Design a protein around this ligand. Structure first.
Ligand SMILES: NC(=O)c1cnc(NC2CCCC2)nc1N
Ligand SMILES: NC(=O)c1cnc(NC2CCCC2)nc1N
Lengths: 237, 237
């Protein structure tokens, strides 16, 4: 079950960063993920291929020009056929987290609209956009990095692309001693069950110390409650 | 006051997405922003230029190999000279928001370490990394998009690169009527003070409706309290 993602962007070449490299580049080459871009600049008709326009009411910056952007979106929708969810990325959208990613990854087709300048006309959001998503509470120069971020996150859910609420456990590889710091002996033990439990305990400890609010949203298993209690007692010596 | 950002990455060509395009591409061309990449692959010595390694304790995936990555980091640090803050990007880090961006943007030099595979050896975090940052609570195939995201966000603070706690107001441009939806008349009025207040009221309304938790962190001005009260009364008819 592959995924098709239409992208509307003034800078489609930025998307080479995900389509030509690494796990996502492989997903594209192997036709697990298809990324197709439309550039509003190609839908302009004036001699200087104008893609921005002045905001009503005045203001510092420009907005994306409506007609080229609208026509690009319509073209992507026509290419997508039925059932594509159209998403605009901005700080005003639903904040993305891994539950949100798993929801988005249920769609076979997405169209991602990337804002530039100061953004896009509100009526295009009303008339063309199904959902608005943010990758986090910060401001960027464009929606392309947010679109790529979203693409990379959902691509991990496509079968073939790759080989629980808590932060990751610490990881160790060679050498056994690095600037005087040794690998925890349990990881050398070959005791699979002890190693599982140690990793889970470490994730519980690190989530508690760094992101305690994330624990509040979980229904811990008996085992997790036990390991967390242990980590907390060790922390309190 | 420009910014230098060292990047450690197995896929330095991904960074063309920010160094060759748009506002950030211009910042680079004009020497406001300098982005310099070191690839651990160039610091390998074996015939197959191996950059991953098996985790102690077992597990599904691989980690980044310590020696090539450590040597790349040391080389970037030597290039940076004194006062560079070294950052590793991962979901285990401090979650980035715009206050975090403004803090990071105070550094003249940053080195950004991009994780691949299942991550990096914990002792490298202990010995080489000053700070750990996340761009949000979701999992990606690599730290490069997070590094670019961070770079784009802080670049906005560099003088020359560009031309308050609340979500943005709606924006409008031509045409005056779009699929039957008209521009709010206040924006056509030319009344600058009325336009300012309308925009601020809209931001307060949209923050309240979509992200009410963001309001809790603000000390609203008398004017903002008034406009928010108005928006809330209109909402309740
Ligand atoms: N946190 C985010 O998701 C995000 C941040 N900044 C922007 N900037 C664009 C949108 C308007 C003009 C440029 N887009 C995003 N999707
Ligand atoms: N939310 C984030 O910031 C983020 C997410 N995923 C990753 N994946 C890398 C890190 C370990 C191997 C791949 N890095 C990040 N910085």
């Amino acid at each position: 079950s592959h995924m098709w993602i239409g992208v509307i962007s003034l800078f489609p070449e930025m998307f080479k960063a995900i389509t030509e490299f690494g796990v996502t580049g492989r997903a594209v080459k192997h036709n697990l993920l298809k990324v197709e871009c439309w550039n509003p600049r190609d839908f302009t008709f004036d001699k200087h291929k104008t893609v921005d326009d002045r905001p009503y009411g005045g203001g510092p910056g420009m907005l994306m020009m409506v007609q080229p952007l609208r026509d690009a979106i319509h073209t992507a929708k026509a290419a997508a056929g039925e059932g594509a969810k159209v998403i605009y990325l901005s700080p005003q959208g639903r904040k993305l987290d891994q539950g949100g990613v798993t929801e988005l990854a249920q769609n076979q087709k997405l169209i991602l609209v990337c804002g530039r300048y100061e953004g896009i006309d509100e009526r295009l959001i009303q008339t063309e956009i199904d959902e608005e998503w943010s990758i986090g509470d910060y401001v960027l120069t464009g929606g392309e990095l947010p679109a790529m971020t979203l693409i990379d996150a959902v691509a991990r859910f496509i079968p073939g692309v790759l080989g629980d609420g808590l932060l990751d456990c610490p990881h160790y590889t060679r050498p056994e001693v690095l600037e005087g710091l040794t690998v925890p002996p349990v990881l050398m033990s070959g005791h699979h069950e002890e190693i599982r439990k140690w990793r889970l305990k470490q994730s519980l400890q690190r989530t508690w110390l760094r992101r305690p609010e994330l624990l509040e949203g979980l229904a811990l298993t008996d085992e997790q409650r036990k390991l967390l209690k242990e980590a907390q007692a060790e922390h309190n010596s």
